[PDB]
Ligand binder design. Structure first.
Ligand SMILES: [Ca+2]
Length: 584
Protein backbone atom coordinates (compact mmCIF):
# COMPACT_ATOMS: atom_id res chain seq x y z
CA UNK A 1 0.00 0.00 0.00
CA UNK A 2 2.81 2.38 0.98
CA UNK A 3 4.85 1.64 -2.15
CA UNK A 4 1.75 2.35 -4.24
CA UNK A 5 1.42 5.81 -2.71
CA UNK A 6 5.16 6.37 -3.09
CA UNK A 7 5.07 5.39 -6.75
CA UNK A 8 2.11 7.71 -7.23
CA UNK A 9 4.21 10.58 -5.84
CA UNK A 10 6.37 10.30 -8.98
CA UNK A 11 3.29 10.90 -11.15
CA UNK A 12 4.08 14.49 -12.09
CA UNK A 13 7.65 14.08 -13.33
CA UNK A 14 6.41 13.61 -16.92
CA UNK A 15 5.24 17.24 -16.84
CA UNK A 16 6.66 19.21 -19.78
CA UNK A 17 7.86 15.94 -21.33
CA UNK A 18 10.90 16.48 -23.58
CA UNK A 19 10.35 15.73 -27.29
CA UNK A 20 6.52 15.41 -27.11
CA UNK A 21 5.55 17.27 -30.27
CA UNK A 22 2.43 19.05 -29.00
CA UNK A 23 4.26 20.37 -25.91
CA UNK A 24 5.20 24.06 -25.94
CA UNK A 25 8.70 23.48 -24.57
CA UNK A 26 9.35 21.45 -27.72
CA UNK A 27 7.47 22.99 -30.61
CA UNK A 28 7.95 26.75 -30.15
CA UNK A 29 11.71 27.20 -30.61
CA UNK A 30 13.99 27.84 -33.59
CA UNK A 31 14.92 24.14 -33.73
CA UNK A 32 11.89 23.22 -35.81
CA UNK A 33 8.36 24.36 -36.60
CA UNK A 34 4.99 22.59 -36.98
CA UNK A 35 2.39 23.23 -39.70
CA UNK A 36 0.34 26.31 -38.84
CA UNK A 37 -2.85 24.28 -39.33
CA UNK A 38 -1.76 22.07 -36.40
CA UNK A 39 -2.15 25.08 -34.11
CA UNK A 40 -5.58 23.77 -33.05
CA UNK A 41 -3.86 20.80 -31.37
CA UNK A 42 -2.26 21.33 -27.96
CA UNK A 43 -0.79 24.53 -26.54
CA UNK A 44 2.30 25.00 -28.71
CA UNK A 45 0.49 27.54 -30.91
CA UNK A 46 -0.67 29.75 -28.04
CA UNK A 47 2.88 29.97 -26.74
CA UNK A 48 4.65 30.39 -30.11
CA UNK A 49 2.24 33.11 -31.25
CA UNK A 50 1.94 34.97 -27.92
CA UNK A 51 -1.77 34.29 -27.47
CA UNK A 52 -1.18 32.31 -24.29
CA UNK A 53 -2.62 34.35 -21.41
CA UNK A 54 -4.04 34.30 -17.88
CA UNK A 55 -7.15 32.67 -19.37
CA UNK A 56 -5.52 30.57 -22.12
CA UNK A 57 -2.64 28.40 -20.93
CA UNK A 58 -0.89 25.20 -19.86
CA UNK A 59 -1.71 25.17 -16.13
CA UNK A 60 1.47 23.21 -15.38
CA UNK A 61 1.41 24.73 -11.90
CA UNK A 62 -1.77 22.86 -10.97
CA UNK A 63 -0.02 19.54 -11.56
CA UNK A 64 3.30 20.22 -9.87
CA UNK A 65 1.71 21.51 -6.68
CA UNK A 66 -0.78 18.62 -6.64
CA UNK A 67 2.06 16.10 -6.58
CA UNK A 68 3.98 18.20 -4.05
CA UNK A 69 0.87 17.77 -1.90
CA UNK A 70 0.89 14.01 -2.39
CA UNK A 71 4.51 13.88 -1.23
CA UNK A 72 3.72 15.61 2.08
CA UNK A 73 0.60 13.47 2.55
CA UNK A 74 2.74 10.33 2.10
CA UNK A 75 5.10 11.51 4.82
CA UNK A 76 2.07 11.89 7.11
CA UNK A 77 0.71 8.42 6.34
CA UNK A 78 4.16 7.09 7.14
CA UNK A 79 4.18 8.85 10.52
CA UNK A 80 0.81 7.27 11.42
CA UNK A 81 1.87 3.66 10.80
CA UNK A 82 5.78 -2.04 7.09
CA UNK A 83 9.46 -1.47 6.27
CA UNK A 84 12.86 -1.19 7.93
CA UNK A 85 14.16 2.10 9.33
CA UNK A 86 16.61 2.22 6.43
CA UNK A 87 13.85 1.79 3.85
CA UNK A 88 11.58 4.40 5.48
CA UNK A 89 14.54 6.80 5.41
CA UNK A 90 14.94 6.10 1.67
CA UNK A 91 11.24 6.80 1.08
CA UNK A 92 11.51 10.11 2.92
CA UNK A 93 14.57 11.04 0.86
CA UNK A 94 12.73 10.20 -2.37
CA UNK A 95 9.88 12.50 -1.30
CA UNK A 96 12.35 15.24 -0.40
CA UNK A 97 13.92 15.03 -3.88
CA UNK A 98 10.51 14.99 -5.56
CA UNK A 99 9.25 18.03 -3.69
CA UNK A 100 12.43 19.90 -4.65
CA UNK A 101 12.23 18.72 -8.26
CA UNK A 102 8.57 19.72 -8.57
CA UNK A 103 9.48 23.21 -7.34
CA UNK A 104 12.27 23.41 -9.93
CA UNK A 105 9.96 22.31 -12.77
CA UNK A 106 7.64 25.11 -11.69
CA UNK A 107 10.40 27.72 -11.16
CA UNK A 108 11.92 27.14 -14.60
CA UNK A 109 8.58 28.04 -16.25
CA UNK A 110 7.03 30.62 -13.91
CA UNK A 111 10.02 32.37 -12.35
CA UNK A 112 9.70 33.32 -8.65
CA UNK A 113 7.27 30.84 -7.05
CA UNK A 114 5.59 29.98 -3.76
CA UNK A 115 7.76 27.64 -1.70
CA UNK A 116 5.54 24.95 -0.17
CA UNK A 117 7.34 23.35 2.76
CA UNK A 118 4.31 21.44 4.06
CA UNK A 119 0.77 20.25 3.27
CA UNK A 120 -7.48 30.83 5.59
CA UNK A 121 -6.63 32.62 2.34
CA UNK A 122 -4.60 35.23 4.23
CA UNK A 123 -2.07 32.56 5.21
CA UNK A 124 -1.34 31.61 1.58
CA UNK A 125 2.22 32.08 0.39
CA UNK A 126 2.77 34.37 -2.58
CA UNK A 127 5.88 34.14 -4.76
CA UNK A 128 9.23 34.17 -2.92
CA UNK A 129 12.19 36.00 -4.50
CA UNK A 130 13.89 33.95 -7.23
CA UNK A 131 17.16 33.72 -5.31
CA UNK A 132 15.32 32.56 -2.17
CA UNK A 133 13.65 29.83 -4.24
CA UNK A 134 16.99 28.75 -5.70
CA UNK A 135 18.61 28.49 -2.26
CA UNK A 136 15.71 26.50 -0.80
CA UNK A 137 15.47 24.04 -3.68
CA UNK A 138 19.25 23.55 -3.80
CA UNK A 139 19.40 22.77 -0.08
CA UNK A 140 16.55 20.28 -0.32
CA UNK A 141 18.32 18.45 -3.16
CA UNK A 142 21.59 18.33 -1.21
CA UNK A 143 19.78 16.87 1.80
CA UNK A 144 18.08 14.16 -0.26
CA UNK A 145 21.42 13.40 -1.93
CA UNK A 146 23.00 12.52 1.43
CA UNK A 147 20.59 9.60 1.75
CA UNK A 148 19.91 8.36 -1.78
CA UNK A 149 22.12 5.81 -3.56
CA UNK A 150 24.28 7.06 -6.45
CA UNK A 151 22.95 4.27 -8.66
CA UNK A 152 20.20 1.64 -8.86
CA UNK A 153 9.85 3.44 -12.58
CA UNK A 154 13.21 5.22 -12.33
CA UNK A 155 13.56 6.10 -8.66
CA UNK A 156 15.64 9.00 -7.36
CA UNK A 157 19.41 8.79 -6.90
CA UNK A 158 21.96 11.13 -5.37
CA UNK A 159 23.30 11.41 -8.92
CA UNK A 160 19.99 12.77 -10.18
CA UNK A 161 19.61 15.10 -7.18
CA UNK A 162 23.05 16.62 -7.82
CA UNK A 163 22.38 16.88 -11.58
CA UNK A 164 19.15 18.80 -10.91
CA UNK A 165 20.96 21.13 -8.51
CA UNK A 166 23.61 21.70 -11.20
CA UNK A 167 21.05 22.69 -13.85
CA UNK A 168 19.18 24.82 -11.30
CA UNK A 169 22.31 26.79 -10.37
CA UNK A 170 23.31 27.11 -14.03
CA UNK A 171 19.90 28.68 -14.73
CA UNK A 172 20.19 30.96 -11.70
CA UNK A 173 23.58 32.26 -12.90
CA UNK A 174 22.26 33.00 -16.40
CA UNK A 175 21.56 36.56 -17.69
CA UNK A 176 17.77 36.38 -17.20
CA UNK A 177 18.15 35.76 -13.47
CA UNK A 178 21.52 37.47 -12.94
CA UNK A 179 21.36 41.02 -14.28
CA UNK A 180 19.27 41.11 -17.47
CA UNK A 181 15.69 40.56 -16.26
CA UNK A 182 13.63 42.90 -18.47
CA UNK A 183 11.11 43.93 -15.75
CA UNK A 184 13.22 45.42 -12.93
CA UNK A 185 10.15 46.98 -11.24
CA UNK A 186 8.20 43.74 -10.92
CA UNK A 187 7.68 42.94 -7.23
CA UNK A 188 5.25 41.65 -4.61
CA UNK A 189 2.39 43.85 -3.44
CA UNK A 190 1.60 42.59 0.03
CA UNK A 191 3.69 39.47 0.48
CA UNK A 192 7.31 39.50 1.64
CA UNK A 193 10.28 37.18 1.18
CA UNK A 194 12.50 36.79 4.27
CA UNK A 195 15.65 38.77 3.50
CA UNK A 196 14.39 40.35 0.28
CA UNK A 197 11.38 42.46 1.24
CA UNK A 198 8.95 42.76 -1.68
CA UNK A 199 11.61 42.22 -4.38
CA UNK A 200 11.26 39.26 -6.77
CA UNK A 201 14.29 39.25 -9.05
CA UNK A 202 17.88 40.48 -8.88
CA UNK A 203 18.73 43.35 -11.23
CA UNK A 204 22.50 43.19 -10.72
CA UNK A 205 25.12 40.80 -12.08
CA UNK A 206 26.67 38.64 -9.36
CA UNK A 207 29.81 36.72 -10.35
CA UNK A 208 29.54 34.47 -7.30
CA UNK A 209 26.48 32.85 -8.87
CA UNK A 210 28.76 31.46 -11.61
CA UNK A 211 31.33 30.25 -9.08
CA UNK A 212 28.57 28.41 -7.21
CA UNK A 213 27.21 26.94 -10.43
CA UNK A 214 30.69 25.72 -11.44
CA UNK A 215 31.15 23.97 -8.10
CA UNK A 216 27.75 22.26 -8.43
CA UNK A 217 28.25 21.27 -12.08
CA UNK A 218 31.70 19.87 -11.26
CA UNK A 219 30.39 17.89 -8.30
CA UNK A 220 27.50 16.49 -10.34
CA UNK A 221 29.81 15.43 -13.17
CA UNK A 222 32.25 13.68 -10.86
CA UNK A 223 29.50 11.89 -8.93
CA UNK A 224 27.83 10.69 -12.14
CA UNK A 225 31.08 9.33 -13.60
CA UNK A 226 32.24 7.64 -10.40
CA UNK A 227 29.66 6.15 -8.01
CA UNK A 228 26.88 6.97 -10.46
CA UNK A 229 28.44 4.57 -12.97
CA UNK A 230 27.65 6.84 -15.93
CA UNK A 231 29.71 7.23 -19.09
CA UNK A 232 29.15 8.66 -22.55
CA UNK A 233 27.65 6.13 -24.97
CA UNK A 234 30.59 5.04 -27.11
CA UNK A 235 29.53 1.67 -28.56
CA UNK A 236 30.21 1.81 -32.29
CA UNK A 237 29.25 -1.76 -33.24
CA UNK A 238 25.59 -2.15 -32.20
CA UNK A 239 24.57 -1.64 -35.87
CA UNK A 240 26.66 -4.70 -36.73
CA UNK A 241 25.21 -6.81 -33.92
CA UNK A 242 21.76 -6.01 -35.31
CA UNK A 243 22.87 -6.88 -38.84
CA UNK A 244 22.34 -3.40 -40.31
CA UNK A 245 24.04 -1.74 -43.27
CA UNK A 246 26.06 1.43 -42.68
CA UNK A 247 23.99 4.50 -43.59
CA UNK A 248 24.11 6.37 -46.89
CA UNK A 249 25.78 9.74 -46.45
CA UNK A 250 26.22 12.07 -49.41
CA UNK A 251 29.94 12.56 -50.01
CA UNK A 252 30.95 9.83 -47.53
CA UNK A 253 30.68 6.55 -49.44
CA UNK A 254 30.87 3.16 -47.71
CA UNK A 255 34.59 2.60 -48.29
CA UNK A 256 37.44 1.58 -45.98
CA UNK A 257 38.62 5.17 -45.35
CA UNK A 258 35.13 6.33 -44.28
CA UNK A 259 34.13 3.48 -41.98
CA UNK A 260 34.83 5.49 -38.81
CA UNK A 261 32.60 8.38 -39.95
CA UNK A 262 29.70 6.09 -40.85
CA UNK A 263 30.01 4.17 -37.58
CA UNK A 264 29.86 7.50 -35.74
CA UNK A 265 26.60 8.26 -37.55
CA UNK A 266 25.05 5.05 -36.24
CA UNK A 267 26.54 5.57 -32.75
CA UNK A 268 24.72 8.89 -32.48
CA UNK A 269 21.44 7.34 -33.59
CA UNK A 270 21.71 4.68 -30.87
CA UNK A 271 23.03 7.09 -28.22
CA UNK A 272 19.62 8.66 -27.74
CA UNK A 273 17.49 5.59 -28.53
CA UNK A 274 18.77 2.77 -26.30
CA UNK A 275 18.26 1.25 -22.83
CA UNK A 276 20.82 0.53 -20.13
CA UNK A 277 20.13 -3.17 -20.82
CA UNK A 278 21.49 -2.52 -24.32
CA UNK A 279 24.71 -1.10 -22.94
CA UNK A 280 23.79 2.57 -22.57
CA UNK A 281 25.22 4.01 -19.34
CA UNK A 282 24.80 7.67 -20.30
CA UNK A 283 21.28 8.26 -19.04
CA UNK A 284 21.02 9.79 -15.56
CA UNK A 285 17.24 10.13 -15.42
CA UNK A 286 14.92 8.54 -17.97
CA UNK A 287 11.16 7.91 -17.97
CA UNK A 288 9.05 5.02 -19.24
CA UNK A 289 6.66 7.62 -20.72
CA UNK A 290 6.95 7.64 -24.53
CA UNK A 291 6.43 10.38 -27.11
CA UNK A 292 4.96 10.18 -30.60
CA UNK A 293 7.13 9.30 -33.59
CA UNK A 294 4.61 9.59 -36.41
CA UNK A 295 4.84 13.39 -36.30
CA UNK A 296 8.49 13.23 -37.45
CA UNK A 297 8.09 10.43 -40.07
CA UNK A 298 7.77 11.30 -43.79
CA UNK A 299 4.34 11.16 -45.41
CA UNK A 300 4.18 8.05 -47.59
CA UNK A 301 6.45 5.33 -46.23
CA UNK A 302 5.44 2.06 -47.87
CA UNK A 303 2.58 0.85 -50.05
CA UNK A 304 0.77 -2.09 -48.44
CA UNK A 305 -0.51 -5.15 -50.32
CA UNK A 306 -4.10 -3.88 -50.11
CA UNK A 307 -3.05 -0.72 -51.95
CA UNK A 308 -3.11 1.65 -48.98
CA UNK A 309 -0.04 3.39 -47.58
CA UNK A 310 1.87 3.32 -44.34
CA UNK A 311 2.21 7.04 -43.67
CA UNK A 312 3.76 9.49 -41.21
CA UNK A 313 2.54 13.03 -40.41
CA UNK A 314 5.79 14.72 -41.48
CA UNK A 315 5.09 17.79 -39.32
CA UNK A 316 8.29 18.16 -37.27
CA UNK A 317 10.13 20.51 -39.61
CA UNK A 318 13.74 21.49 -38.87
CA UNK A 319 14.61 25.13 -39.66
CA UNK A 320 17.44 26.49 -41.77
CA UNK A 321 18.80 27.71 -38.41
CA UNK A 322 19.16 24.06 -37.40
CA UNK A 323 20.61 23.12 -40.80
CA UNK A 324 23.07 26.03 -40.52
CA UNK A 325 24.26 25.40 -36.97
CA UNK A 326 24.98 21.71 -36.97
CA UNK A 327 28.68 21.51 -37.78
CA UNK A 328 30.65 20.75 -40.91
CA UNK A 329 32.75 17.55 -40.86
CA UNK A 330 35.57 19.79 -39.59
CA UNK A 331 33.53 20.75 -36.52
CA UNK A 332 32.88 24.35 -37.60
CA UNK A 333 29.75 26.36 -38.44
CA UNK A 334 29.08 26.14 -42.20
CA UNK A 335 29.19 29.94 -42.60
CA UNK A 336 32.50 30.26 -40.72
CA UNK A 337 34.29 27.24 -42.23
CA UNK A 338 36.73 28.49 -44.89
CA UNK A 339 36.83 25.03 -46.51
CA UNK A 340 33.04 24.72 -46.75
CA UNK A 341 30.74 25.70 -49.63
CA UNK A 342 30.16 29.48 -49.70
CA UNK A 343 26.63 30.44 -48.62
CA UNK A 344 25.87 31.75 -52.12
CA UNK A 345 26.07 28.15 -53.36
CA UNK A 346 24.36 26.29 -50.49
CA UNK A 347 21.14 25.74 -52.44
CA UNK A 348 22.79 24.36 -55.58
CA UNK A 349 22.58 20.65 -56.37
CA UNK A 350 25.57 18.65 -55.13
CA UNK A 351 25.34 16.77 -58.42
CA UNK A 352 25.18 13.28 -56.88
CA UNK A 353 24.04 10.71 -59.46
CA UNK A 354 20.50 9.42 -58.80
CA UNK A 355 20.25 11.81 -55.84
CA UNK A 356 20.47 15.14 -57.66
CA UNK A 357 17.98 16.69 -55.21
CA UNK A 358 20.65 16.81 -52.48
CA UNK A 359 21.83 20.43 -52.07
CA UNK A 360 25.40 21.41 -51.20
CA UNK A 361 24.45 22.63 -47.71
CA UNK A 362 23.69 18.99 -46.86
CA UNK A 363 27.04 17.60 -47.99
CA UNK A 364 30.25 17.73 -45.93
CA UNK A 365 28.55 17.82 -42.53
CA UNK A 366 29.29 16.18 -39.14
CA UNK A 367 28.06 12.70 -38.19
CA UNK A 368 25.36 14.08 -35.80
CA UNK A 369 23.84 15.91 -38.79
CA UNK A 370 23.32 12.72 -40.85
CA UNK A 371 22.38 10.76 -37.72
CA UNK A 372 19.51 13.06 -36.79
CA UNK A 373 18.45 15.07 -39.88
CA UNK A 374 16.95 14.14 -43.25
CA UNK A 375 16.49 15.98 -46.53
CA UNK A 376 15.35 15.81 -50.17
CA UNK A 377 17.35 13.18 -52.07
CA UNK A 378 18.64 11.60 -48.85
CA UNK A 379 17.67 8.47 -46.91
CA UNK A 380 15.27 8.31 -43.96
CA UNK A 381 15.97 5.43 -41.56
CA UNK A 382 17.61 2.08 -42.25
CA UNK A 383 15.02 -0.73 -42.42
CA UNK A 384 12.19 1.76 -42.76
CA UNK A 385 10.53 0.72 -46.04
CA UNK A 386 10.15 -3.07 -45.74
CA UNK A 387 13.83 -3.50 -44.89
CA UNK A 388 15.37 -0.68 -46.93
CA UNK A 389 16.04 3.01 -46.26
CA UNK A 390 13.40 5.39 -47.56
CA UNK A 391 14.58 7.86 -50.21
CA UNK A 392 12.96 11.28 -49.66
CA UNK A 393 11.18 13.03 -52.54
CA UNK A 394 10.25 16.30 -50.87
CA UNK A 395 9.17 17.95 -54.16
CA UNK A 396 6.82 15.13 -55.25
CA UNK A 397 3.25 15.83 -54.14
CA UNK A 398 2.46 12.15 -54.59
CA UNK A 399 5.15 10.99 -52.13
CA UNK A 400 6.70 13.32 -49.53
CA UNK A 401 5.92 16.83 -50.76
CA UNK A 402 3.26 19.38 -49.90
CA UNK A 403 -0.22 18.36 -51.08
CA UNK A 404 -3.30 20.45 -50.12
CA UNK A 405 -5.62 17.50 -50.88
CA UNK A 406 -4.16 15.27 -48.14
CA UNK A 407 -6.41 14.82 -45.12
CA UNK A 408 -5.27 17.28 -42.45
CA UNK A 409 -2.73 18.81 -44.85
CA UNK A 410 0.21 17.12 -43.14
CA UNK A 411 3.55 18.27 -44.59
CA UNK A 412 7.05 19.49 -43.73
CA UNK A 413 6.86 23.26 -43.30
CA UNK A 414 10.53 23.70 -44.22
CA UNK A 415 11.39 20.93 -46.66
CA UNK A 416 13.51 19.17 -44.02
CA UNK A 417 12.78 16.34 -41.54
CA UNK A 418 14.38 14.87 -38.41
CA UNK A 419 15.00 11.22 -37.55
CA UNK A 420 16.42 11.81 -34.06
CA UNK A 421 15.28 9.08 -31.61
CA UNK A 422 14.15 6.87 -34.51
CA UNK A 423 15.26 3.27 -33.82
CA UNK A 424 17.47 2.03 -36.71
CA UNK A 425 15.51 -1.26 -36.73
CA UNK A 426 12.20 0.57 -37.34
CA UNK A 427 10.48 -1.17 -40.25
CA UNK A 428 7.09 -1.03 -41.95
CA UNK A 429 5.71 -4.21 -43.55
CA UNK A 430 4.06 -4.69 -46.95
CA UNK A 431 1.68 -7.26 -45.44
CA UNK A 432 0.66 -4.64 -42.88
CA UNK A 433 1.84 -3.68 -39.41
CA UNK A 434 5.28 -2.49 -38.40
CA UNK A 435 7.97 -2.44 -35.74
CA UNK A 436 9.84 0.36 -33.99
CA UNK A 437 12.58 -1.97 -32.74
CA UNK A 438 13.09 -1.59 -28.99
CA UNK A 439 11.63 1.38 -27.10
CA UNK A 440 13.92 3.62 -25.07
CA UNK A 441 13.37 5.81 -22.01
CA UNK A 442 12.53 9.46 -22.60
CA UNK A 443 15.61 11.37 -21.48
CA UNK A 444 15.30 14.03 -18.76
CA UNK A 445 18.99 14.07 -17.76
CA UNK A 446 21.97 12.50 -19.52
CA UNK A 447 25.73 12.74 -19.02
CA UNK A 448 26.49 14.85 -22.11
CA UNK A 449 24.60 17.74 -20.48
CA UNK A 450 26.83 17.63 -17.39
CA UNK A 451 29.93 18.16 -19.59
CA UNK A 452 28.20 21.04 -21.37
CA UNK A 453 27.09 22.58 -18.06
CA UNK A 454 30.65 22.51 -16.74
CA UNK A 455 31.90 24.07 -20.00
CA UNK A 456 29.39 26.93 -19.78
CA UNK A 457 30.39 27.74 -16.19
CA UNK A 458 34.10 27.76 -17.06
CA UNK A 459 33.37 29.99 -20.06
CA UNK A 460 31.46 32.52 -17.95
CA UNK A 461 34.41 32.68 -15.52
CA UNK A 462 37.00 33.06 -18.27
CA UNK A 463 38.55 29.62 -17.81
CA UNK A 464 38.99 29.03 -21.54
CA UNK A 465 41.07 25.83 -21.63
CA UNK A 466 38.94 24.28 -18.90
CA UNK A 467 35.78 25.00 -20.93
CA UNK A 468 37.45 23.45 -23.97
CA UNK A 469 38.43 20.37 -21.97
CA UNK A 470 34.80 19.99 -20.88
CA UNK A 471 33.47 20.26 -24.46
CA UNK A 472 35.98 17.92 -26.09
CA UNK A 473 34.69 14.59 -24.70
CA UNK A 474 31.32 15.37 -26.30
CA UNK A 475 32.92 16.48 -29.57
CA UNK A 476 35.21 13.47 -29.80
CA UNK A 477 32.36 11.05 -29.10
CA UNK A 478 30.42 12.64 -31.97
CA UNK A 479 33.40 12.26 -34.33
CA UNK A 480 34.44 15.86 -34.96
CA UNK A 481 37.81 17.47 -34.14
CA UNK A 482 38.70 18.63 -30.64
CA UNK A 483 38.78 22.36 -29.90
CA UNK A 484 42.08 24.10 -29.12
CA UNK A 485 42.88 27.68 -28.09
CA UNK A 486 43.52 28.53 -31.75
CA UNK A 487 39.78 27.95 -32.37
CA UNK A 488 38.77 30.64 -29.89
CA UNK A 489 38.53 33.98 -31.69
CA UNK A 490 36.62 37.27 -31.75
CA UNK A 491 34.44 35.69 -34.43
CA UNK A 492 33.82 32.46 -32.52
CA UNK A 493 34.20 32.90 -28.76
CA UNK A 494 34.40 30.17 -26.14
CA UNK A 495 30.82 31.09 -25.19
CA UNK A 496 29.81 30.81 -28.88
CA UNK A 497 31.28 27.30 -28.94
CA UNK A 498 29.60 26.21 -25.70
CA UNK A 499 26.19 27.50 -26.74
CA UNK A 500 26.41 25.87 -30.16
CA UNK A 501 27.61 22.53 -28.85
CA UNK A 502 24.58 22.61 -26.58
CA UNK A 503 22.29 23.46 -29.50
CA UNK A 504 23.57 20.48 -31.47
CA UNK A 505 24.12 17.77 -28.86
CA UNK A 506 20.84 18.30 -26.98
CA UNK A 507 18.77 19.11 -30.08
CA UNK A 508 15.05 18.30 -29.57
CA UNK A 509 15.63 17.23 -25.91
CA UNK A 510 13.64 20.15 -24.46
CA UNK A 511 16.57 22.47 -23.68
CA UNK A 512 16.48 25.22 -26.34
CA UNK A 513 13.21 26.58 -24.88
CA UNK A 514 14.89 27.21 -21.55
CA UNK A 515 18.37 28.13 -22.77
CA UNK A 516 17.32 30.89 -25.15
CA UNK A 517 15.18 32.25 -22.31
CA UNK A 518 17.85 32.14 -19.59
CA UNK A 519 20.35 33.73 -22.00
CA UNK A 520 17.79 36.55 -22.40
CA UNK A 521 17.93 36.16 -26.18
CA UNK A 522 14.24 35.65 -27.01
CA UNK A 523 14.13 38.45 -29.59
CA UNK A 524 17.31 37.30 -31.34
CA UNK A 525 16.26 33.68 -31.87
CA UNK A 526 12.48 33.41 -31.42
CA UNK A 527 11.34 36.75 -32.88
CA UNK A 528 9.20 37.48 -35.93
CA UNK A 529 10.62 36.28 -39.27
CA UNK A 530 13.64 34.61 -37.62
CA UNK A 531 12.43 31.08 -38.48
CA UNK A 532 13.25 30.06 -42.06
CA UNK A 533 13.17 27.02 -44.33
CA UNK A 534 12.88 26.03 -47.99
CA UNK A 535 9.99 26.93 -50.29
CA UNK A 536 8.08 23.86 -49.08
CA UNK A 537 4.42 24.92 -49.09
CA UNK A 538 4.06 24.98 -52.86
CA UNK A 539 2.71 21.84 -54.52
CA UNK A 540 5.12 20.20 -57.00
CA UNK A 541 7.94 22.75 -57.07
CA UNK A 542 10.94 22.59 -59.39
CA UNK A 543 14.36 22.07 -57.78
CA UNK A 544 15.15 25.73 -58.37
CA UNK A 545 12.00 27.18 -56.80
CA UNK A 546 12.03 24.65 -53.94
CA UNK A 547 15.55 25.46 -52.80
CA UNK A 548 15.09 29.11 -51.89
CA UNK A 549 15.44 30.65 -48.43
CA UNK A 550 11.87 31.25 -47.30
CA UNK A 551 10.49 32.91 -44.17
CA UNK A 552 8.17 30.63 -42.21
CA UNK A 553 4.75 32.18 -42.64
CA UNK A 554 2.90 32.13 -39.33
CA UNK A 555 2.42 34.73 -36.58
CA UNK A 556 5.63 33.98 -34.63
CA UNK A 557 6.76 36.86 -32.44
CA UNK A 558 8.83 37.57 -29.36
CA UNK A 559 7.83 39.94 -26.61
CA UNK A 560 9.44 39.99 -23.19
CA UNK A 561 6.40 38.72 -21.28
CA UNK A 562 7.06 35.36 -22.95
CA UNK A 563 10.10 34.66 -20.74
CA UNK A 564 7.60 33.48 -18.11
CA UNK A 565 4.45 31.33 -18.07
CA UNK A 566 1.37 33.35 -17.12
CA UNK A 567 -0.42 32.43 -13.93
CA UNK A 568 -3.90 31.09 -14.36
CA UNK A 569 -6.28 33.98 -13.68
CA UNK A 570 -8.19 31.89 -11.11
CA UNK A 571 -5.04 31.19 -9.10
CA UNK A 572 -4.24 34.91 -9.06
CA UNK A 573 -7.73 35.58 -7.74
CA UNK A 574 -7.89 32.65 -5.31
CA UNK A 575 -4.59 33.68 -3.70
CA UNK A 576 -4.46 37.34 -2.53
CA UNK A 577 -0.66 37.19 -2.07
CA UNK A 578 -0.15 36.12 -5.69
CA UNK A 579 1.02 38.50 -8.43
CA UNK A 580 0.71 37.95 -12.18
CA UNK A 581 3.80 37.69 -14.36
CA UNK A 582 4.83 40.91 -16.15
CA UNK A 583 2.99 41.76 -19.34
CA UNK A 584 0.15 39.35 -18.60
CA1 LIG B 1 15.79 1.55 -29.39
Amino acid sequence: RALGFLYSCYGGVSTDLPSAYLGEINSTTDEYVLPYSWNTDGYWGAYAFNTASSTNQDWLWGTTYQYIGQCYLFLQKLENAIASDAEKEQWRAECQFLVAYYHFATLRRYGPIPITDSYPTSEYNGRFHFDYCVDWIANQLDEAAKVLPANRWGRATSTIAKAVKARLLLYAASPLWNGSFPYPNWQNENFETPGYGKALVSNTYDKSKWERALAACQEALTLATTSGDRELYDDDEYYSRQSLNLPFVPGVADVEDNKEFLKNVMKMRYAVSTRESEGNKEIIWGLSNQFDFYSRYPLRILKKSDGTWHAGYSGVSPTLYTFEHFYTANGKLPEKDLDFTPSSEWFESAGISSREDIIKLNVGREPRFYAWMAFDGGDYGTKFAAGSPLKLEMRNSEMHGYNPSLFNRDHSVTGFLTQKFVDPVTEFYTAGGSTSGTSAPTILFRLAELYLNVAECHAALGNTQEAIDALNPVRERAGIPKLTLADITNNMTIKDWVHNERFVELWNEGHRFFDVRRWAEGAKYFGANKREGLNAEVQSPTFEEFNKRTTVDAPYVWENRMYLNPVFYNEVYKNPQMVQAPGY
